[PDB]
């Protein structure tokens, strides 16, 4: 599958990619995407992993690439098989084995930093897009805020990340959908971005499925 990233944001974003399930990383694990620019990476089948965008990046005084949001700690533009330090908006994709049914989403389970959408191109089935188009940072309550030095809110933690309570993380005794309902905090994310997952046991969306080896477009600030 071809995964094309598009930056619709007014500022540069530095995407990252991470292959899960102990499988090999994609050819690009991090790159620079200027405002309005696009870039593609190929994924094998099957494949399961995650994508994000880092913001406010710069090579620092020590010569290490560091970002104020979603930094992957590699000291390079490439993330080299490391994931983001949350909070970070995530796109997750599972590419099916043998041309089967992929499934995917935008997730705010690890918080938010940038608006993102993911949409399959081609394939067969529902193949509907998942999106979080809102700038959730603008409505992020204090205990969830991450701020830059200029005082701007640059990311918004999920309640699981910020507080850790089992009722937020959906861990025992709240380890099932029945015992882990939505909270006031997950509802912040849900109201802003209803077509994204707002917590661990947000009801799965059967339209976020697509068969027959679709390509994908991932958009920042859709």
C-alpha angles and dihedrals in degrees: 000000000000114000112200119194120204125189110211091166121109091238137051118280125194110211124208131201130201129186114214134198090061090285128141120285120250119259090261118044096168138003146161120265114187119210107290093007127127134205133178137216129184124234127198127225125283099027134152125188150106142266132202141161126240121212137200093025128169140156100256131225089274092055094254123132107238132169131202091222131040094353112180096206097234095118087229138083086248111074091208096210097319123124130226124279098238150264091082137138107240136203110203123194131181109195109205126238116250098010093303133144113311118201128199146157149175107255132198093182088113092040130256139285107152134018110253140177133190123200130174118230116213120341122111135270131041094333094173122166124251115213147177101187098162124098093237090181088075092064100033113132119232100257089056099043127113111194135201120223090261084062096248118141104244101173142010123221122221114240089249089057095042101040109012097211113158089237088063100038094039094233126137127345084017094042098128135061089248091054097039109060125171116285135209087264099048086049090061088063095037094054092048094043113020092166092060131069112263101189142002096280100032101145109272115246113231091200090066089082131099132176136204103046105296122190117233138225117204114193130194113211093006 
